[PDB]
Design a binder for this molecule. Structure first.
Ligand SMILES: Cc1cncc(-n2c(=O)nc(N3Cc4ccccc4C3)n(Cc3cc(F)c(F)c(F)c3)c2=O)c1
Ligand SMILES: Cc1cncc(-n2c(=O)nc(N3Cc4ccccc4C3)n(Cc3cc(F)c(F)c(F)c3)c2=O)c1
Lengths: 296, 297
């Protein structure tokens, strides 16, 4: 049962390169605006303690170079919204998909188009971890790469990539430049807090295992939310809420395994351990309930 | 992380093909649509299809090709092995630079899973040694294609034909020749024993080292023959001298000789992981090639 990203085509045609002095990274071109990390206005020197207000006031249109493929776009306007730089350009993107900017919640999944020098290099499927980091595969030069979900023909942009934290995980904002998690866009000592496991996604993935005929961990027992939560907290698993239960309801119906029955399965796996489920030795938590229905 | 190639160049080629009551996906390149030839069958015909007999009874107007909203007009058709080629009157304007390649077991590629000619998702997989792929495919996915994109050229290597009893997948190159000994007929055919792709596992261990993971290394070396005698008792594929040569550059970059990495693998197979992890995995990963690792590292 595979991690599956959305087809990236609608986003590929919006990626550009943005250079400011000696700093280059990626930008998103929608209509006549290009969106990118505001830190592109900084030298490495500046990043120690940047004053973005001042750094921007001292800049103007001619300090920015935007390349769409080989064609240079001329910048005719610059502004900052939170941690995102918005450059107005002379040409509107004729490949602009229908889109919107949404902010996602921890535990939600999305696709990422890793790019280098404005060139798309690959796509993969992630989740917003409970500690507001993402376990992505960004290399140097990936800053400004976006994350998205597609619904019919409408792209929902939810992530812009800003940085790697010391532990190898990533940190970013929404497209309005609001960070996910307690991070700042300056070269200072920052760390992700203790991560937890996304309980409702694990349960979703057990449903997928049963659907695929992997049934060994089912048992005759059931649980309570409180007894389960006591176990959940013991193992660094997110609290399971009624909202969660309700959301799994469609998979509860389609397999005959109610959530507190499935919770009793998960309870036992936490304690005793496992052998394999869907070809995995670890309990997987980056598929949502919605994701399991889409793919199953 | 297993990354797929950006799918947009292929998305622009996907269409819906219908013949009578049967509908699957096709691939619109220039003025041709490629698709599985069993589009011309009913479920009844699938036990013992005579494709030559079924095809000669068809005319151009029997094939409904649909490109999003637009009906393409079929003006010719021929069969090449297990692929049907439908000549249409419009060249696909979104045709990318492309070629058709046939791949070998161990090679990776991206799949664009499509339904009714509509792309729904993209994933990365590999040709298993038993010539199946472990894909993610529902009913209606036939005609979905696998590809690599090496510098702006799309190399098509797979077209999806069928699911086998174990839930693995069988299909052709874009000249319509099947990977492995499978046939496009409902028969008792089954995937042989799946083995692990040793040379890929080694590649991924070299990746772990380059990302600063060394805990699984040991002080030992091995001969090639002793390595293979041992690995095959865990259903690992044999490592050939070619594999060893192929790993040469990763050997040089890290400073760890191939046979030392081999010794390390033997130890991992004996010990398991003792509750720890390698590039985030509690299993040994075999779906990254030497090329994929060099490319992304
Ligand atoms: C392996 C990896 C994975 N994801 C992201 C990065 N990453 C990167 O590619 N480039 C950065 N740069 C360039 C530059 C040019 C001029 C001035 C400053 C910088 C920093 N950074 C570091 C970075 C990003 C921030 F947003 C930030 F606030 C900070 F302090 C450092 C990468 O992390 C690296
Ligand atoms: C879960 C899954 C994953 N990948 C592929 C399939 N798959 C499918 O979607 N449809 C098939 N059909 C419809 C039809 C309409 C008219 C005539 C015949 C068929 C069979 N088949 C079965 C199949 C495909 C072959 F190529 C083949 F040679 C065979 F005998 C059976 C699917 O496997 C299923």
């Amino acid at each position: 049962f595979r991690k599956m990203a959305f087809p990236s085509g609608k986003v590929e045609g919006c990626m550009v390169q943005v250079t400011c002095g000696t700093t280059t990274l990626n930008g998103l071109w929608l209509d006549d605006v290009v969106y990118c990390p505001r830190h592109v206005i900084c030298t490495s020197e500046d990043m120690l303690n940047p004053n973005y207000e001042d750094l921007l006031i001292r800049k103007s249109n001619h300090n920015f170079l935007v390349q769409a493929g080989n064609v240079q776009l001329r910048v005719i306007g610059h502004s900052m919204q939170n941690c995102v730089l918005k450059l107005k350009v002379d040409t509107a993107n004729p490949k602009t998909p229908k889109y919107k900017f949404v902010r996602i919640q921890p535990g939600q999944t999305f696709s990422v188009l890793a790019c280098y020098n404005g060139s798309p290099s690959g796509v993969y499927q992630c989740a917003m971890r409970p500690n507001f980091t993402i376990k992505g595969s960004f290399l140097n030069g990936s800053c400004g790469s976006v994350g998205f979900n597609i619904d019919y023909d409408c792209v929902s942009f939810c992530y812009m990539h800003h940085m790697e934290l010391p532990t190898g995980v990533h940190a970013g904002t929404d497209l309005e430049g609001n960070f996910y998690g307690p991070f700042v866009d300056r070269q200072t000592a920052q760390a992700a807090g203790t991560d937890t496991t996304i309980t409702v996604n694990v349960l979703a993935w057990l449903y997928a295992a049963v659907i695929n005929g992997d049934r060994w961990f089912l048992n005759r027992f059931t649980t309570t939310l409180n007894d389960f939560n006591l176990v959940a907290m013991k193992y660094n698993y997110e609290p399971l809420t009624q909202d969660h239960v309700d959301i799994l309801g469609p998979l509860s119906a389609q397999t005959g395994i109610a959530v507190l029955d499935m919770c009793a399965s998960l309870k036992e796996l936490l304690q005793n351990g496992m052998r394999t489920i869907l070809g995995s030795a670890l309990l997987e938590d980056e598929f949502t309930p919605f994701d399991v229905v889409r793919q199953c």
